[PDB]
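Handout, section 4.2: multi-component inputs.
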Amino acid sequence: DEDETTALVCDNGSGLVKAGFAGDDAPRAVFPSIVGRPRHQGVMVGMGQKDSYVGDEAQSKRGILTLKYPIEHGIITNWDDMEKIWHHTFYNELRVAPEEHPTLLTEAPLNPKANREKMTQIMFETFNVPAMYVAIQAVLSLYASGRTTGIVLDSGDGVTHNVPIYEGYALPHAIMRLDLAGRDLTDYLMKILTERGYSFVTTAEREIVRDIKEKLCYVALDFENEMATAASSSSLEKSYELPDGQVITIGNERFRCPETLFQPSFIGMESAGIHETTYNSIMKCDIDIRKDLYANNVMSGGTTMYPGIADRMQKEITALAPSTMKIKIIAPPERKYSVWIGGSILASLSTFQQMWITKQEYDEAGPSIVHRKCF
Amino acid sequence: DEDETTALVCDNGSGLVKAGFAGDDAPRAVFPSIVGRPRHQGVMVGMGQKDSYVGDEAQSKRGILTLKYPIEHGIITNWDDMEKIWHHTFYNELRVAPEEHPTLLTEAPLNPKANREKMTQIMFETFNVPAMYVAIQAVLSLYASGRTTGIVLDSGDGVTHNVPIYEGYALPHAIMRLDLAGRDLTDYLMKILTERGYSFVTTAEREIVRDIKEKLCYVALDFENEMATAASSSSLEKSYELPDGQVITIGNERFRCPETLFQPSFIGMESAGIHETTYNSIMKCDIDIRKDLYANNVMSGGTTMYPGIADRMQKEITALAPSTMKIKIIAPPERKYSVWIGGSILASLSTFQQMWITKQEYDEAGPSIVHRKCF
Amino acid sequence: DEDETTALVCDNGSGLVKAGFAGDDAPRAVFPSIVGRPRHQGVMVGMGQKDSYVGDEAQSKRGILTLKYPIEHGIITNWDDMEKIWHHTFYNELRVAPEEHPTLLTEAPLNPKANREKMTQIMFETFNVPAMYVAIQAVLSLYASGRTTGIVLDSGDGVTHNVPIYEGYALPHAIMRLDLAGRDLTDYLMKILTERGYSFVTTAEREIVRDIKEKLCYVALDFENEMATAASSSSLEKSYELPDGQVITIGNERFRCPETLFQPSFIGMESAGIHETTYNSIMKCDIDIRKDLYANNVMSGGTTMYPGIADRMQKEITALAPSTMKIKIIAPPERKYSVWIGGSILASLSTFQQMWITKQEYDEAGPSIVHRKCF
Amino acid sequence: LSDKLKEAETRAEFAERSVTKLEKSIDDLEDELYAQKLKYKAISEELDHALNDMTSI
Amino acid sequence: LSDKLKEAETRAEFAERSVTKLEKSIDDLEDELYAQKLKYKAISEELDHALNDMTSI
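Output:
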């Protein structure tokens, strides 16, 4: 509920969409970035049944639906599905019509430009939003974390960008984009669970493995030591109950999934991992910047939920990092929700009300305008 | 905050800015002559952020700034950045306002006249100082050291002046203005540290090297012997800790840099070194002058603080000089900051209160007046 | 397979290696400075398969190899990998044993001492070369161009050294070492091609972008006007064919890349560009030297093959230079092969036979000898 | 589960106080370490400085 | 509550591990502060004792 024409804020990834009203500390609505479609022939009539299902509808009726998402490795590929997600999120759950509210959408700085143009176009042409702005995900993560300086390691579902910012300024030459994210970690787990005798390939099955990953996995402070024990003893297996009452137990696979973050070679990627990019983004920053970024490396986005990741990352960076200097990783509670929270912080600033693209400038120029007006 | 209209005294050089009030025995504060500017695009909103930073602000936020020095080897060219340096020096440090105090600034005897005219113009037109006086650095150097007769060896960051003064009179035909200074040593050290595998090319790197030089360097009494051992053993090496935690170990570069003062050919300069210019400035004077000048070679400015510098120059001058006669270097602890002290001495003399340009004479004549009123 | 005991010429850089026999006009063995290694688990047996691949082998089998460069920013960081490059270049392609062929290697004037001594050591202890020499690329560039005077802009993959020579003598105080090179231009292009929807990060992708740059990029004489049309119309776009049959179409990125040479801030570098450094290499030399260096601005090495660069530079230096003065660029079609050609000229010169360090002097003094004997 | 939760939550919050107490103590020890490092540094440097000035005589 | 317990247990375990990490880091700071003082005041204060003798003569 809202009693003022505040800006709307909405973070959109390949995982989930978080939305709410600017000025709060949390989204008021969170939906999966999913549009579902039936793959069966109907026989009964007078059954209702939709052509397409969105967000929670897509998951609730998923037993006979194929589930697809609109965003791939940071970009929108299906604008029509994003319009459905936002229509449902804004009008049915948040009960707000964007026509009366400015809207803030987000992306990291290296995100292909088509994404910013589509975010701008959908809100101006299908929602008639009076104003738009596309913000940097690293900017919003630092606002949420209480920082102006730090490196944002946005280990989300799609892509990780690891963007360094100092005194509120971009250091773009040092953004070390990485082709490793939560969606790939799910795929690793599906293959290793197949080795254990449980094949997961269809939509319902893919959703189960994603759910297993989120609830059972952890990074492991020491991979080899954790594996030496997990591979030898059943006492480290965690039992997950499958939707049909059957169970699956997961042992060292429980940590080998997130280990891909430290071992991308697990999914065929030519990279050492998220700690390597954390290190390279700071390594390329000015010598008089480094000390402030090393003491403030920032976790943002999801996959940061791993109760093994907090110590695993600081150990891995400290090992590469300079002596004398304090090396530290910030792993705030505003995790998995930091971009939305930062969005609220930015959207509600008085200093940000001059940053909006109006629905005047938009129609005169078209959506390419976002490329000149936002950053 | 002062309870008297004491003159303000400031040495605004290519290196440091020294300031305090007339009548004291030291500058109250010393900081670099730096105005810094962001070299990056801002991305966070509501971050404050200046267009330019001054002095210690410029160094404190330097991680994203390019840093410039308005004074070029003794002359002021970027008067706008110097207005900011003076405003900071006076109001944020000394807590004085030139409007309520006469002001004394200083320059070398063969410094281009443009320097004295521009300093006079700005202090009268932008700070509304009631009076001005551009002093000679050589005059101030001997006042601080306690001599009416001697050679001023002011070997600081900008230029080495080399001027003989006898009984308070200039002997100008014997001035050996030399383009060899502490500023060249910083850049030369960056190049020889590059030879060791530690390249330095940027502002941050230059400020790091200036710090290495100021803390690790010396000249030594016997260069070749110091060189032979430094080049052969770790026993003459000294480490330096960089701002980012890197450690550089420096050997004969520790003195090979500073040695450029005696061997200018190291930086491509056509010069016999500071000891020969001292020697010749005396040899060009009458024989009833030389007896007093050789016994009173007086150090002022930076680089005079290097171990072995007074002994190194005295040895070389003595070797070039005739026997029977005594050759001596005066090198008091009030080094590098002694010209400021001399400014305090001059500003506070009763015999100097008739030497001021007032803000009447100034407006009637314009800033060129300094050329006739000061000396 | 050669008919004379002629020294080899091997211009081994951070990019490619041009090798051949002294006395000729061209290299005979041209390889990338690449050592490749498999990053996959084998399934078939009896497949041969090397631990490492070099030069053309590294590129031919690159589909599953990670490719590394043993040389970075002008120096060898991995000498074991250079022994592998050298063994192949010498024995398989040039088909010569160094034992009877002294071999000339190249370096930049301010290149770290460690690199010049390590190159000397490998050729004497691993290849048993009878003698060694390490040459200055600027010397070689001037011989190839028919000059003893000029500014050599050796603008290759590693470092742009900006080094002046007059009447065959070095003018080292005026060398402007610059941390901007062809490798950075490649990285910049990968980042702006990401903006267009084509991210490039892996070895295959890194090699593709370097090939795109070499084939499609240019500077022209006016960036802003070229950008105004490139950013507005498909008429300035050029398509590049990717190895799998897919294509990438590139617009203003085509010139924005190499423009970093004139705008280093594009990669976060604190520099005014290559024309400022060329200018300072001329300007920092004596006034009676400047006229000859202005008239002999010499293009050498890589990046000199960007369309419009020889004239772009003459224009940009002219813009900084005094009027009346003639600024001239030397830019023959033998561009970039001029270092190799000079290596041939110098190595075979009768006046330079005494400049070779023999494998007598080498063992008595050790590899540091190169520092005292070559120049 | 309510009792096990009360214990896990109580133990977690308590242990979280042990986390903040150890953490705080670590920061305080680090401030002391720093101060100690600073004094060490200041003393060695004051002596090395003075010694360099006073190496001669 | 089973999940709240697993979560509280994760928090309890987290706190036990965080406490363990800090048990290690407190001891590292207890040993580093100790070592730094033990070597720093002991050496630099010793260097000032040496001053008592160094600056004699």
